[PDB]
Structure 1
């Protein structure tokens, strides 16, 4: 560490978190593909409040009816100090503006991320068959090749005195 903060442990943890490579796969439990008739109401009891909040306070007409849900582990996000805002922005910037994502706050009893692929103006009939397949493909890619923060080829870091 820097000679002016070598003895500090909080800055040690900060730099360790800034260099350690962590992926969404390490902070998620499961991924689900759901069907929702419209991007305004939900069938899952839990996300009813999240959708209402985000939609109420602030396009959505052309969102696809297929939803991608990620269930994230608070015990996994507390081992390394992470907040939903950083990961949400990371996902939003991996694909700049070609899909809409909402994320629950840390205060929620359960941690969930909801994503929806946005279709273009043109309507494709052949892509409907592989729509769910495309969802699984993007799920695999966003699970594997996403660098939330850290340096490449860094498996794990351990602090020692």
Structure 2
């Protein structure tokens, strides 16, 4: 089962259970959600520059039954989220012991390196783009 779990094209579409795109301007208090203790790791580095993360949260929840047979851990899901996209995006994930599925993607400003015309896309729409591309096309 496990050595040949490395097949079957597990895509985040069937691993996830829910999703939600939120507006959190200050992450320290996720007034939109009910998990503020996870923010305590927004204390050293969200890969850099807390002052330049976009305020749009993409809360994705991952069913644990679907995830427990493939055993594809949120550590590995995090690895793939990093690798496939890089540092343009970000992430921070709960432990598995939480029993409440959660993982959150944040879009670094992408002007974070260097800061008024027709947009690439408003970050609102562009989070509904990484909510399809990553949901169907990512190969976990």
Give TM class, smaller chain: 0.7 to 0.9
Cα distance change, pair 38–125 in 1 and its aligned pair in 2 (3 A): farther
SS in 2 for 1:17: coil
Q: Report the CA distance between 1:111 and its aligned residue.
A: 1.3
Within the candidate set 21, 27, 30, 2:9 is matched to 21
SS in 2 for 1:144: helix
Higher relative contact order (CA 8 A, sep 6+): 1
- Cα offset for 1:25? 0.6
Q: For 1:43-122, what aligned pairs fall within 5 Å after superposition?
A: 43-52=31-40, 54-56=41-43, 59-119=49-109, 120-121=111-112, 122=114
| The structure with more radius of gyration | 1
CA RMSD in angstroms comes to 2.0
Q: Distance in 2 between matches of 1:129 and 1:14?
A: 41
Query: Cα offset for 1:35?
Result: 0.5
How far, CA to CA, are the matches of 2:52 and 2:31 in structure 1?
A: 19
Q: CA deviation at 1:57?
A: 5.6
Q: Across the two proteins, how many residue pairs are aligned to each other?
A: 135
SS in 2 for 1:18: coil
List per-residue Cα deviations over 1:61-119 (Å, max 9, x = no partner): 10001110101101111121121100011001111110121111100021111111011
- The SS at the match of 2:10 is coil
Residue pair 2:28, 2:36 contacting (<8 A) in 1 also = no
**What's the TM-score once normalised by structure 2's chain length?**
0.86
Task: Please state whether the residue corresponding to 1:114 is helix, strand or coil.
Answer: strand
Uncovered stretches (5+) of structure 1, i.e. residues with no partner: 1-12, 149-161
TM-score (norm 1): 0.76
Unaligned stretches of 5+ residues in structure 2: none
CA distance in 2, matches of 1:27, 1:75: 9
Q: Distance in 2 between matches of 1:126 and 1:32?
A: 26
